[PDB]
Amino acid sequence: NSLGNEGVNLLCRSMRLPHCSLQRLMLNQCHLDTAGCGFLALALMGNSWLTHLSLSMNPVEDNGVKLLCEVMREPSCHLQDLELVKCHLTAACCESLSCVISRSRHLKSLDLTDNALGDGGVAALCEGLKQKNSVLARLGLKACGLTSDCCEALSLALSCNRHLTSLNLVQNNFSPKGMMKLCSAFACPTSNLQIIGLWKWQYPVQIRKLLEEVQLLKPRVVIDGSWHSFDEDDRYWWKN
Amino acid sequence: LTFSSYGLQWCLYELDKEEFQTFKELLKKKSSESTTCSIPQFEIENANVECLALLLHEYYGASLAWATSISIFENMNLRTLSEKARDDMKRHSPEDGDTWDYKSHVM
Amino acid sequence: SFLSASLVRILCEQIASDTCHLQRVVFKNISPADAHRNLCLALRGHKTVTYLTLQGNDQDDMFPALCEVLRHPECNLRYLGLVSCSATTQQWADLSLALEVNQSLTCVNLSDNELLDEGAKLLYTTLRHPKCFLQRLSLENCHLTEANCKDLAAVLVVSRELTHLCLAKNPIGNTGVKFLCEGLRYPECKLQTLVLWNCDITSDGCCDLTKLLQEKSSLLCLDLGLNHIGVKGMKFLCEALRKPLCNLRCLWLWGCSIPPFSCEDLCSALSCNQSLVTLDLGQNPLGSSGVKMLFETLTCSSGTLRTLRLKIDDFNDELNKLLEEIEEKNPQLIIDTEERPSSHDFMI
Amino acid sequence: LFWDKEPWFWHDTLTEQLWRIFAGVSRFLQSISWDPEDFEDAWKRKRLAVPCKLEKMRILAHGELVLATAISSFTRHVFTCGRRGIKVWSLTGQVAEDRFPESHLPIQTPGAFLRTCLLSSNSRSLLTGGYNLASVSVWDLAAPSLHVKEQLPCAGLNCQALDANLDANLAFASFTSGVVRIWDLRDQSVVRDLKGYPDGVKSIVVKGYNIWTGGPDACLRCWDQRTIMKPLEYQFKSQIMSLSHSPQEDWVLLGMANGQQWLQSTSGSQRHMVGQKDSVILSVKFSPFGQWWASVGMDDFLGVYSMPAGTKVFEVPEMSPVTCCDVSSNNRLVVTGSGEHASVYQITY
Fold first, then answer.
1. Does the keyword Protein transport apply (chain D)?
2. How far apart are CA A118 and CA A96, in angstroms?
3. Separation of first and last alpha carbons in chain A
4. Which among C191, C142, C186 is positioned nearest to C162, based on CA atoms?
């Protein structure tokens, strides 16, 4: 719906009050911009009821995400799930998001799909996730143009982390050496990922048998390309 | 008459249910705009694909109904079905001693 | 030669002058390094030198001078030969870039150079460039391996001037020949001559080569040596030669251990074939029955081959009259029964 | 098939058990589905959606090196080409690997070969050509029995690329002497000749009045049929191996033989690389709806790419180099050919 910044501002003014009681709001393809994201940032501070927020397929640029991150970084905020897709992000946005992830305590889900984060942004995010204070539950990466060095850093990050459960790396170009590193990280007892997004058949025989060897270890893990497998039913059921 | 509507019926079967509803609505608009030839709205609504093709041919005519369907196909951003329809129209629309002894013995 | 500064100065001036008319030049084991570098610099832009071969004990500064010589827009040396020169990967890299820049030479001879896989990949990347006209190329005792062979198959598919190619003393027997078949089955390959020698060719390679030959392929010549292909390999080769479609011109068989039971099929094939022009045999135990059957069939048949060579363990008067019968029955056949300038090497 | 440990069907295990009894001594593969209502893939949360999954569902043994392929979805058949003849397969039965063609069309002539093949879009004819052959032959597929209906003459010429435009009843072919001929299928008479470039043109693509050709000389040319003007050249740095055209939007896809893919616009001279590999690209094919394309190269890989920027959605490995690919008009089946076999994959999304 072509709501626009004006409509988002009117909703913002309505949600500013403490007596609103709605918990989940979604706005995709609503012609948002940086100013609308600023309105949402102003409305979000001081509100404790709303929990799930989504802004996908909107050209909310790096700066808008910076405003949102600055707003969310105080513990007072009670936002758990935020997912934004196709928002034209870059590396500096990723550094700010990494600071958010390391510091905050209430966020439990995040989604970055069809964004050109590249290797630098993912390196910053790996620094963010390395901290044992983080409590992020699931992370969505796809079509983010990853490569060998970033996957090495990511493998080390996963080796260091314990709280993360679900992940996604599809439509990404990985060289065999990087995948060897990734699988070595996967097999470690330290990391307990219950869901992984990868296509087994996309890789050579050595890699395929390596993934199968990782699988026979930790029989609970499931590797399935089509993400959203065994995910919470409510997330998609609510929408339709 | 039947030979031409057979191909049209088989072209429309490619359209999906949502595409079929869009086709019917666009046909409603086309009929409303034109004044030379008219179609009832409730009859367009109640008809399914087979009745739609036969009704289209009953009112417009063979070539005119084919051309209308092709134009509407192009309008919905379908280009492959347009070419298939043009070809199927090109095909469905009419232009406007010893041997004798041997064989007896074998017998 | 160990030279001195004054001699080298005068000599290089003489070489660089317009009164010089050298067409071939060879510098090997020149010392010290500065003198060799100065000599190679004298050739920069020469209007008459069309050959050049190089060799030395130390090479740390050979490559800068050679690459300057090649990068020159006026150098016209048509043939370049590097022998036993030691180098490193960066040296191969800048030499390959120079050969990318160069537009004159058509024959390159790299023998005994300690290439590894990486340098081979760089040279191949140079050869796939759409603007190189290297027609002949030798990689002998370069210590290659099958993966380079797959890259070379890609080169063969892509390249558009390379006709002669030599791969001797390279352990690329089975997988290498499989990949070369993958590259040569392509209906538009241009290669005309391939050389295999001490490459560990076996029956599988013979089968693949036969499958290549039965079709209308490009290569006119094929060389085999130190390849034990006795029974199955020769079965495949002879059933290949028998057909009317083969256009192979020359076939070399040396140290291949052809037994008499294979020689019967060999003789049948020779009687059947009509397009081969040259054949070579040597070190193969054909002595008692094989030679006699071969000579008898040669007298009986009238094949197109002109030259034929063999070695006989022990001959008699009957064998001499058999040779006379071969001569009289067909006058155009020349038979001998007695190595760098070898005919193929003369062509490459 | 080859990827799995062993491909089994649902009735095959019962047949095996009954055979054991008689002699006295996921997990199951699926078949390919045709009806759109059966397809039943959930909406992501006709169609321009980018595919997201693949599965091999048959292997076709040709018996000799496969040079070209073609797939039809209106009829279920598949066409395979080799140096000695063409073989027609059927996709209606259920079997892991088939050895019995629906038909076989051999060509007998001393020193005659086949290189190319091409299936008209309406699935009613099929073109064929090769070296040392008297003429380019077209087969009639709609008739009750296969037979050659027309012969398009070319004496002492070696064709290497074929293309056809049915709206204007034209057929094109490129010969090794750098000559392109245009035939009018009604009369089978040559119309116009394009010449002047010795290296030849390995690939030709026709849309509208523009013929796009590219060859090892590292140039891409755009001929116009309405006039005798010189072609417009776009110089590249490597040698082009294949071409394809976008049906909806103005964009020409091409492979560079150095593992690079580019897009080129007809209206203006804009370029931008859309993918890179370590191998030689031997064929690039566009999807009928134009939102993705398939690529096959020398390093044993089949890949699918996304039109907007060139991101590769996924790819599948293989044991031997692939040399040709084709995508069905249903946008659901893709066929590739390596070694002496041809494989069929189904697209789901």
1. no
2. 15
3. 17
4. C191
HEC string of A151-197 equals HHHHHHHHHHCCCCCECCEECCCCCHHHHHHHHHHHCCCCCCCCEEC
Q: What is the amino acid identity at position D292?
A: W
Dihedral sign, CA of A103, A109, A113, A118?
A: positive
- The CA angle A35-A51-A33, to the nearest 5 degrees, is 15
To probe the interface with B, which of D34, D37, D46 has the most B CB atoms within 10 Å? D46
Q: Is D301 helix (H, G, I), strand (E, B) or coil?
A: strand
| Interface chains of chain D (3 or more CB pairs under 8 Å) | A, B, C
Q: Please, which residues have CB within 8 angstroms of residue D235's CB and are 6 or more apart in sequence?
A: D218, D219
* Cα(B57)–Cα(B45) distance, integer angstroms: 16
Please give the structure tokens belonging to residue D121: 């879009």
Query: Are the beta carbons of D343 and D56 closer than 8 angstroms?
Result: yes
Give the count of beta carbons closer than 10 Å to the beta carbon of residue A131.
14
DSSP D278-297: SS-EEEEEE-TTSSEEEEEE
> Could you count the other beta carbons within 10 Å of the beta carbon of residue D34?
13
- C-beta neighbour count of D2 within 10 angstroms: 12
**What region, left, alpha or beta, does residue C333 occupy, with left being phi > 0 and alpha being psi -120 to 50 degrees?**
beta
How were these coordinates obtained? cryo-EM
Give the pair of three-digit tokens for residue C192: 């005309």
Sequence-distant (6+) residues with CB within 8 A of B42 are none
The SS3 call for residue A50 is coil
Whether chain D lies against chain B with 3 or more Cβ pairs closer than 8 A is yes
CB atoms within 10 A of CB B22: 15
Q: How far apart are CA B83 and CA A134, in angstroms?
A: 57
Q: Dihedral, CA atoms, D281, D286, D287, D290, nearest 10 degrees?
A: 130
Chain C interface disruption, residue of D62, D84, D238, D319, most C CBs within 10 A:
D238
Under 8 Å between Cβ of C152 and C121: no
Beta bridge partner(s), residue C136: C107
Tokens 């010189």 sit at which residue?
D230
Residues of D in contact with C127 (CB under 8 A): none
Number of residues that make up chain C: 348
- Listed residue (C215, C224, C167) closest to C189, CA to CA: C215
- What's the rounded Cα separation, in Å, for the pair D194 and D231? 10
Interface of B with D in 62-101 (CB under 8 A): 78-80, 83-84, 86-87
Asked if B19 and D36 come within 8 Å (Cβ–Cβ), the reply is: no
Cα separation of D163 and D223, whole Å?
A: 15
One-letter amino acid of C229: I
**CA–CA distance, D330 with D334 (Å, rounded to integer):** 10
Residue owning tokens 């008297």? D134
